[PDB]
Design a protein around this ligand. Sequence first.
Ligand SMILES: CCCC1C(=O)N2C(N(C)C)=Nc3ccc(C)cc3N2C1=O
Ligand SMILES: CCCC1C(=O)N2C(N(C)C)=Nc3ccc(C)cc3N2C1=O
Length: 578
Amino acid sequence: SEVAHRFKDLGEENFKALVLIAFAQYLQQCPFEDHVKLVNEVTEFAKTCVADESAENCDKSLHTLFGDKLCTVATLRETYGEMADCCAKQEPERNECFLQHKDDNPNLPRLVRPEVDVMCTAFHDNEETFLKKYLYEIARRHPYFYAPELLFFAKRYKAAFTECCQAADKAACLLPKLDELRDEGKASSAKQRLKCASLQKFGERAFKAWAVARLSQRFPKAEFAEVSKLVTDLTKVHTECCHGDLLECADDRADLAKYICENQDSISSKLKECCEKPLLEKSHCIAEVENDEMPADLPSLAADFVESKDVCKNYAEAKDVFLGMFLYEYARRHPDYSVVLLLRLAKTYETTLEKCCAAADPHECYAKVFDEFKPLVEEPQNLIKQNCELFEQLGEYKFQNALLVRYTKKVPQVSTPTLVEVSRNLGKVGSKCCKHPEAKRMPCAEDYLSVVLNQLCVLHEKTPVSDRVTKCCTESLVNRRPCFSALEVDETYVPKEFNAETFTFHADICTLSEKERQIKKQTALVELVKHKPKATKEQLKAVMDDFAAFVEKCCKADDKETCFAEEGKKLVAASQAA
Ligand SMILES: CCCC1C(=O)N2C(N(C)C)=Nc3ccc(C)cc3N2C1=O
Ligand SMILES: CCCC1C(=O)N2C(N(C)C)=Nc3ccc(C)cc3N2C1=O
């Protein structure tokens, strides 16, 4: 039995949660209730298997079990149409079908939160249900949310209410901590989406490379044989969490933290504090631990990678181990380099050894490789230096508008909402990284841009409308950013035509939070640039300044909401003029 296997390892609490998240992440539309039912029916079954390890079907694979349980409600196409397909299939045909149907943008209603008085009541009255509802709302909206980590956010979430509800002003104590959590989880969720896209779209070799370079930066003192050990396991973990095998992912993830803490001295000296706490907190700590100090006397890379005469021979013997080593070596001494640049260099090196080693005199040929790294290294530095300057001058909001105009011009076919979210996140790189010293700027900026551009790539993959987004997203994982930065304006885009339904206005806007207004303002700017690409940042600007005036005004006018009827036709006259 496997269900029994995992149960004993995780226990009732975690086992019950993971299965909830797994169910929530598969049938994102189904109601909380039904998920709970199935979870319990599933948990009960497990309990018997523990005793009699051959009872009913305790001999199967989680999937068959999990799959059939969901198929007791999925067959309801009237609710989940395209799902019935999946159930008519059989493992593994069935499982893939489910994974392939997860929605990165569910049509789930916004999740507003009741007043502090209700939450604390509901929390206090019934706890487990309160926290179950939390996991369900997160897992269903983030189908790739790294499960093990979601449990950590949960324990954290619980402590928020557990303390704040006993305050002198709950609202004051809760709100903050709740906000800080909503953000941090959106970040977690995106870093994870990239890892799964990598594994799924590009293959484990690509993820392995990513990991080697990332881990080598974090643990410079660790050894190549050691890192590789870690890279092998870590890859398996994610591979499981990204294929929907949550229980094993969680299990293996625990075993990995166990190992890493045991062999502490062999890996990093900054792990101590991590290994002295509860599992869930232990794991989250290791994954976020700062890099260890760099080993003192380190030889020059040129030694064994460009000057040695045995280069090509070693490359031929174990090209993967050789390139593996080159990356580990270059990464361990460059924590000031974003992981994607390290991978670009590694690819530039591989390409060179390929053409060079089949030459009349390899050495002569590959002797100047580092001369090419110079451009690759400076491109990002200059880009960051430039973009943080602009940011510092315009502030976040204005900087995001800039990126909005700029991207809409690159890929005008992309849907306005997607362009708005992505440009807003791209501009958050300013506040997130520009306040760093150049030594830490690049890894912060350029790797964060990979996570943001991946969203666009996955949101776009649902309904592809721009081959330029497809080219840049599918050509090379590591070069995505460089690809997009090269795009200028689409010369073949045929401008749109002003609609009435292209953009509705109904006064309902004067009630929305401040943020939700800039957003409505930004959504406008996008639609503008699509209707007038060839327009300039001069006109556009002056115009944006106008719209601000319209809202600030009419939202303070006492006529029936017809000040838009009259002034709405008024602005239209001005707009067409520009
Ligand atoms: C639009 C954002 C609404 C929103 C929100 O408030 N959330 C929240 N709460 C309830 C604190 N915690 C989260 C933690 C991690 C993630 C990924 C998402 C949320 N979650 C949301 O999606
Ligand atoms: C960027 C950090 C590199 C990195 C790292 O050290 N990780 C790790 N261990 C314990 C090796 N376990 C994980 C668990 C959860 C998350 C979200 C990420 C990791 N994983 C990484 O992605």
